[PDB]
Amino acid sequence: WSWESYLEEQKAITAPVSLFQDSQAVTHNKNGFKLGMKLEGIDPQHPSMYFILTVAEVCGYRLRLHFDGYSECHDFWVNANSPDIHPAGWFEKTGHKLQPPKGYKEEEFSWSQYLRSTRAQAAPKHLFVSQSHSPPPLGFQVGMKLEAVDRMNPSLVCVASVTDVVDSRFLVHFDNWDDTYDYWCDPSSPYIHPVGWCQKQGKPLTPPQDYPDPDNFCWEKYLEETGASAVPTWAFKVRPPHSFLVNMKLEAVDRRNPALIRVASVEDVEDHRIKIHFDGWSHGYDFWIDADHPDIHPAGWCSKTGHPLQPPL
């Protein structure tokens, strides 16, 4: 419809652009991804692993990615400035494992041969914001240890490690567990803390799964034992609480069908999270989201990038 008219009739305001990260707000970059182009990226459900991906669909500044060789039911949407995709050849050049297309073996796969065989184009390098050409985030090296909140069970703070570093971000892994609970973040993430934070703050520390003598867990001896060093305390940066207020309006991807982006409202707030409500729909669809999540955007984002906006119901 139009935002201008909607804000008059609702007597409301939009969340100002300044409240968002530059990456959530930027509309002036062209989407250079094209149908059929090949690339590499993380599997969202297994964020430690990399796969060969094909551009299946483009919609404004977003794209839908397909896992080569696998079912179309695993297809997923990202923004064109996603740091979780990389150009062909990136795995080899940066020390990452490639999970190759269904039916191949890790070391049977060659990009050269694959491209000859498919007659496909690799998405050009200059499309990617993340190619490991930038010096890492300060003080977070692979193997280093920290304390991390299980985002799936937020009443737990757990023994964790850095297991991956790519440009300004790093992968938080929970020791002796699956990669299923892992997540990417930066040094200002409010979900991570230095070694010794639990004991100093009062809350208990969940030790690694199947660890000998769980209640008797000592950090300094775990470190010596695993030949690891703790991430240094000066590395953990303060991210201030966001400044979103209740009733501010914005645009948000619908989690029930991620092809769609809707008119939305801030229903509630925490220090680092906002509760999204889709205007005109039931509150039952309301969901909590991190303020720096890639799938929320300032009013106007859709119109300026060429993606349809679902009006309110």
Next chain:
Amino acid sequence: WSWESYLEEQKAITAPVSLFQDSQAVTHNKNGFKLGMKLEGIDPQHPSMYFILTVAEVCGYRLRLHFDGYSECHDFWVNANSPDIHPAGWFEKTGHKLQPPKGYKEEEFSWSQYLRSTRAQAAPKHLFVSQSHSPPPLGFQVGMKLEAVDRMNPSLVCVASVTDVVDSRFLVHFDNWDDTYDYWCDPSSPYIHPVGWCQKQGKPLTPPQDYPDPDNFCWEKYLEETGASAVPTWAFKVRPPHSFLVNMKLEAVDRRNPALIRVASVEDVEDHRIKIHFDGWSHGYDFWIDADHPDIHPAGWCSKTGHPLQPPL
């Protein structure tokens, strides 16, 4: 819209004024609180903690309070007869700790200097129902132990302590937790019981969060080692069940939007609680509330206090 005409078309009745605590029913007191006045009060999210607060808005007999130095997102609403607010200087005079405005440390804070610097007025003493002038709740002293229901997880009766006493009320604290589960009450609360009650009643007692050997928890040993005594059994003076009956109508603060007060009905009853239904709204917004809660009121309270009432629908 009137109450008389509504009761006619629904052939309904209002809960009589006599069912309510005097404090919930009183309409003839003026609200002397003014915009910008400063005061002290508990943080409702951390009820053991006291902060400098400013009057941000007034509406009838209710006011919205702002945490000096902090964001407006934390503002909250109380009644002008709230016992959870106190005049400037109260914390020093009564042995309470002040969490000072965002940039301060506790001991640098002085009211005289703050008033001089802000040019603000302290809310006058005469507005406050609770200034620690009244006689304390007989029997309940600071440091005494008892058994308390976890209102957030009501199947659990837990090891607890008295951590604060203010006039006829006291603060119940769950041993080894922070204060997020704590609550203020009086000797007639149905949520508290003497040391030994769980044992005599055949119910499971939850020991402190990380008591070394929980299965073998023993009150006589715990009391000895913490140098504490039990609140005397005689001090626990249960209130009788309330007499609100299903379908009775009243006014209640909207929990999702505390600025608003709505027409409401008793959907359901327990001995000490009532289930509130907002007339004309989904039953999914229905909620259980203590019968003595400050945010339910007899029909006519909004009109007599100068607060808008949201009619049904």
